[PDB]
Design a protein around this ligand. Structure first.
Ligand SMILES: Cc1cc(N)nc(-c2c(Cl)cc3c(N4C[C@H]5CC[C@@H](C4)N5)nc(OC[C@@]45CCCN4C[C@H](F)C5)nc3c2F)c1C(F)(F)F
Ligand SMILES: Nc1nc2c(ncn2[C@@H]2O[C@H](COP(=O)(O)OP(=O)(O)O)[C@@H](O)[C@H]2O)c(=O)[nH]1
Ligand SMILES: [Mg+2]
Length: 170
């Protein structure tokens, strides 16, 4: 049997949620993906010898807090909170995503990774120390990624799976 891990990718428009997801699954950079499409993708992987199935929701669309939308998000076991290292506003929004996840999950201990995407670009408007400090304040890992080159992408998703696997053992 293989365990299935339900992962949700969140963050502002344009941070690279779709490119990160498509890069992880299909091993290629999709540069101008329709910003309005939300979809889910699966991939069979081996993490620390465990053959398992990832089910990843790439979020998009309207911000809305209906009971049905909350319940759908509540089925997520782990969350990647993504910002772009060249977009200060996307980094300022991270606290909001963390707050909504903690509310629907009814806990401060939710498997989560802070992802600083577009690390292939030299314009670091978001300070590295500030992002590391934010991740430290939540007790979660901070991983820099590039959906373009795949740098850090497997590490971000596999770290999240390791956090879920550990959370289920509590
Ligand atoms: C657990 C949970 C429950 C639940 N019901 N919904 C969510 C959720 C989702 Cl699914 C999408 C959001 C979203 N959109 C999806 C994509 C990205 C931007 C746009 C709209 N298209 N935007 C915002 O906030 C946007 C900002 C800017 C304007 C005012 N808001 C408040 C802050 F300033 C940030 N939050 C979002 C959000 F919270 C979540 C969670 F957290 F998991 F994502
Ligand atoms: N250079 C670079 N561009 C990226 C990267 N990830 C995404 N992009 C670009 O940033 C834009 C937004 O990406 P997208 O996947 O649509 O973001 P989403 O709105 O969060 O789904 C697109 O023009 C992508 O080509 C990355 O790691 N590096
Ligand atoms: Mg998208």
């Amino acid at each position: 049997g293989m365990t299935e891990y339900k992962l949700v990718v969140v963050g502002a428009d344009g941070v690279g949620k779709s490119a990160l997801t498509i890069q992880l699954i299909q091993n290629h950079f999709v540069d101008e993906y329709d910003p309005t499409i939300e979809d889910s993708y699966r991939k069979q992987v081996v993490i620390d010898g465990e053959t398992c199935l990832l089910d990843i929701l790439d979020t998009a669309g309207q911000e809305e807090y209906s009971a049905m939308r909350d319940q759908y998000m509540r089925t997520g076991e782990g969350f990647l909170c993504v910002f772009a290292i060249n977009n200060t506003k996307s980094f300022e929004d991270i606290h909001h995503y963390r707050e909504q996840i903690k509310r629907v999950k009814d806990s401060e201990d939710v498997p989560m990774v802070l992802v600083g995407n577009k690390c292939d670009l030299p314009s670091r408007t978001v300070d590295t120390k500030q992002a590391q400090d934010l991740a430290r304040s939540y007790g979660i890992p901070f991983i820099e990624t590039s959906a373009k080159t795949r740098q850090g992408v497997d590490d971000a998703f596999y770290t999240l799976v390791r956090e879920i696997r550990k959370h289920k053992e509590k």
